[PDB]
Coordinates of N, CA and C in Angstrom, one line a residue:
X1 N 166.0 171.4 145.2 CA 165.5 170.1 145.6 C 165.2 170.1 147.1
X2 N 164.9 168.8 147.7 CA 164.9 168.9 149.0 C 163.4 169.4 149.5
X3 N 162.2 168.6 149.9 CA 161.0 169.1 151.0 C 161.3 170.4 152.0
X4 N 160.6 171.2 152.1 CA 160.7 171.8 153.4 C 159.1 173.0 153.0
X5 N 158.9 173.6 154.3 CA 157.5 174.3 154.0 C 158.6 175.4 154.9
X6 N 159.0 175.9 154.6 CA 159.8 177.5 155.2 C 159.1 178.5 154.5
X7 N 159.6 179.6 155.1 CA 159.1 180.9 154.4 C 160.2 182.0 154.4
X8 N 160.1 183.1 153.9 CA 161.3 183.9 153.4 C 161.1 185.3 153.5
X9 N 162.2 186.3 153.1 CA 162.2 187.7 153.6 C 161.9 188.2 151.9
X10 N 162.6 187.7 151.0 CA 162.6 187.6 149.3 C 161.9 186.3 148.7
X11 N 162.3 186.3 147.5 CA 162.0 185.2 147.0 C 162.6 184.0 146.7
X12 N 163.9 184.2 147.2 CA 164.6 183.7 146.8 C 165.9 183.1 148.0
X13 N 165.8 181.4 148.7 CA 166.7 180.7 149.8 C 168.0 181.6 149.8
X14 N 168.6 181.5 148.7 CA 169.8 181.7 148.0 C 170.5 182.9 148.6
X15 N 169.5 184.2 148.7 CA 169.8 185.7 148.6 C 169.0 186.0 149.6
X16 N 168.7 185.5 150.3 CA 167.3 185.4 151.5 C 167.8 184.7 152.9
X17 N 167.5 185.1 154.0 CA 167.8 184.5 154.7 C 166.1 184.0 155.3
X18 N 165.8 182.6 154.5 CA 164.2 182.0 155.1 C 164.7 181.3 156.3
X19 N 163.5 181.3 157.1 CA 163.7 180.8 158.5 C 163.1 178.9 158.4
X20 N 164.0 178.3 158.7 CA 164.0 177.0 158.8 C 163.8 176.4 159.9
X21 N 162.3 176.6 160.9 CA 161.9 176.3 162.0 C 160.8 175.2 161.7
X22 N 160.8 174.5 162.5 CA 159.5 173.4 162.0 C 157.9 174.3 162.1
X23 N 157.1 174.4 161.2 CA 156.2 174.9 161.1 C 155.0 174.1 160.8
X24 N 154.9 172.9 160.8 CA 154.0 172.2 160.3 C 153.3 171.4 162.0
X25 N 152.2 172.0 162.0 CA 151.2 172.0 163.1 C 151.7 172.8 164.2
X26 N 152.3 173.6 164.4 CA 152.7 174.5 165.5 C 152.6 176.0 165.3
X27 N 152.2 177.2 166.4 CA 151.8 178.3 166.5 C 152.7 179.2 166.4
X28 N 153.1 179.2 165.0 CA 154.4 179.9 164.7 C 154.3 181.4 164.1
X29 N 155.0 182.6 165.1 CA 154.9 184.2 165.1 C 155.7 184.4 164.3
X30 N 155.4 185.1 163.2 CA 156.4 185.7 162.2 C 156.1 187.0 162.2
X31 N 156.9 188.2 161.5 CA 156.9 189.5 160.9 C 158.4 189.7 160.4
X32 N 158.8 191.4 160.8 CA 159.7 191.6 160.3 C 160.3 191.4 159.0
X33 N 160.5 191.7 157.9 CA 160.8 191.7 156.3 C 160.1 190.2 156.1
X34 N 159.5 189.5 156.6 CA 159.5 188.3 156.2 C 157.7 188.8 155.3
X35 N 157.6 188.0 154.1 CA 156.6 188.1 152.7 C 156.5 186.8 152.3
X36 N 157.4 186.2 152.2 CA 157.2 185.2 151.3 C 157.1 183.6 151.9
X37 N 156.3 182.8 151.3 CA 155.9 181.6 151.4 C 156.8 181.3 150.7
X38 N 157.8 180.4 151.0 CA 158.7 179.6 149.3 C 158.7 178.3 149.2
X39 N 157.6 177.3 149.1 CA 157.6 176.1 149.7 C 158.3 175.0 149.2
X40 N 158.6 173.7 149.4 CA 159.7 172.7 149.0 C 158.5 171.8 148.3
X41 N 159.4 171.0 147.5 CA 158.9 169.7 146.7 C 158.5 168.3 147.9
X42 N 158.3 168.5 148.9 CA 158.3 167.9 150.2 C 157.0 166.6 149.7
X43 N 155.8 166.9 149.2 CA 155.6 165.8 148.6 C 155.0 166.1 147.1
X44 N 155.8 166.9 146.5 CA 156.1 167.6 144.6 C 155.0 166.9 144.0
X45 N 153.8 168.0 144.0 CA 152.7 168.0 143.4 C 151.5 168.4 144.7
X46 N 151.5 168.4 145.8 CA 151.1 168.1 146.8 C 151.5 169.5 147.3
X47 N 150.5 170.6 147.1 CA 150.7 172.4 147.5 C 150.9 171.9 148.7
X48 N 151.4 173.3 149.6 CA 151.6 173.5 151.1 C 150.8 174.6 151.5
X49 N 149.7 174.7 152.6 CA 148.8 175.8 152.9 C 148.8 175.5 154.3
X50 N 148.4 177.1 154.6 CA 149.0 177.5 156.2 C 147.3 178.3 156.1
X51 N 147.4 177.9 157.8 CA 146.4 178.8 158.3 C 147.0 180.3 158.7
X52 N 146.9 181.4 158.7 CA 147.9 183.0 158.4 C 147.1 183.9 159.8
X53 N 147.8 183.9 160.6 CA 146.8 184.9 161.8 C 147.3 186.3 161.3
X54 N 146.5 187.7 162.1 CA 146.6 188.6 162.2 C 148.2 189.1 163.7
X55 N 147.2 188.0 164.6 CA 148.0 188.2 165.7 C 149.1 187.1 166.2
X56 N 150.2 187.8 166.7 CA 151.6 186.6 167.1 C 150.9 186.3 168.5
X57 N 151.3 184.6 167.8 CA 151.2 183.5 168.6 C 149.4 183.2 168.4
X58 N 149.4 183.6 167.3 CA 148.0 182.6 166.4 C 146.5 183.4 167.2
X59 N 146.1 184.5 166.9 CA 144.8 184.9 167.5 C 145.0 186.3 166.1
X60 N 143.7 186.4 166.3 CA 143.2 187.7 165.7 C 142.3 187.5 164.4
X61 N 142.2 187.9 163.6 CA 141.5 187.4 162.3 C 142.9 186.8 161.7
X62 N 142.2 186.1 160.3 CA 143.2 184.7 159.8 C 142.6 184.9 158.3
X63 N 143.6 184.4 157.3 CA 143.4 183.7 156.2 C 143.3 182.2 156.4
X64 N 142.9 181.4 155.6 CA 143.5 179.9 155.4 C 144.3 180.4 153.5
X65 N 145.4 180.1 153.4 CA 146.1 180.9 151.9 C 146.9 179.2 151.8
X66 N 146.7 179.1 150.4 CA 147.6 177.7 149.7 C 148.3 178.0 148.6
X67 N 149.2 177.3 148.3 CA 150.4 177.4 147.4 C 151.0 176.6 146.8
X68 N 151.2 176.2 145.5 CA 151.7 174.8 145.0 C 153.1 174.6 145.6
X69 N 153.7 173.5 145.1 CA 155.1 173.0 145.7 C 156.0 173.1 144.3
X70 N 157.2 173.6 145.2 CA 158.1 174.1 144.6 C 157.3 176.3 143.9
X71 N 157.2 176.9 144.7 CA 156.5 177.8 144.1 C 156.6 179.2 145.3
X72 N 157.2 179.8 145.3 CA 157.1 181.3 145.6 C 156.4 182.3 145.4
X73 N 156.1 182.4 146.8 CA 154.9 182.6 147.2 C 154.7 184.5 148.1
X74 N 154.3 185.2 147.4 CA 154.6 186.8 148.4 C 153.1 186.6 149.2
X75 N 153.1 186.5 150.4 CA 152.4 187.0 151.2 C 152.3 188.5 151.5
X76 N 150.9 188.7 151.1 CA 150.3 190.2 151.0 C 148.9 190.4 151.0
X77 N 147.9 190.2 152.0 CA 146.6 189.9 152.8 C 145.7 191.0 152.8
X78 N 144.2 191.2 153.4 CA 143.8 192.5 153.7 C 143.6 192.9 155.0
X79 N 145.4 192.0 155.7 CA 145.5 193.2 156.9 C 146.8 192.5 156.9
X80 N 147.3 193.4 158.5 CA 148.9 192.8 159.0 C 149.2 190.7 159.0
X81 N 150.2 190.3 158.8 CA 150.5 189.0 159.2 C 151.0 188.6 160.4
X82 N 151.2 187.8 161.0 CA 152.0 187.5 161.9 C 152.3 186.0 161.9
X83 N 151.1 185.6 162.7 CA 151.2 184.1 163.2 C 150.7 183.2 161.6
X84 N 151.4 182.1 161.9 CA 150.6 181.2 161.1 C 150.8 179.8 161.5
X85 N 150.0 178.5 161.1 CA 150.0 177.1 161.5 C 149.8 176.1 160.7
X86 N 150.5 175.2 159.6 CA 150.1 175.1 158.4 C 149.1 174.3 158.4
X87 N 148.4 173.9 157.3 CA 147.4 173.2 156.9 C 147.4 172.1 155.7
X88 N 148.2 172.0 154.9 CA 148.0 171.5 153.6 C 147.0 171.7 152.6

């Protein structure tokens, strides 16, 4: 239960250590084990989608990638990840 748009190293909060930083409109650098999108019932029915950079701190080539709510998600692109900045 519980809204949140975090992301994760697994698939799984539980056995995962996902990073719980505010990510909704802000230029947020990820890597390291981190794959997965695991998004919250935040408004349950109402997917969560992130714009996905190449490069940390939001530059390089990008996906725009979406995901339903409540739904885990492996991030795996046709190039490296880094940055991303959500979208809905």
């Amino acid at each position: 239960g519980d809204g949140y748009l975090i992301m994760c190293k697994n698939c799984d909060p539980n056995t995962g250590s996902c990073d719980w930083k505010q990510n909704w409109n802000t230029c947020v650098g990820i890597g390291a084990n981190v794959h997965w999108m695991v998004t919250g019932g935040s408004t349950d029915g109402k997917q969560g989608c992130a714009t996905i950079w190449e490069g940390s701190g939001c530059v390089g080539r990008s996906t725009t990638m979406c995901c339903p709510a409540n739904t885990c998600c492996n991030i795996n692109t046709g190039f490296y990840i880094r940055s991303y900045r959500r979208v809905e």
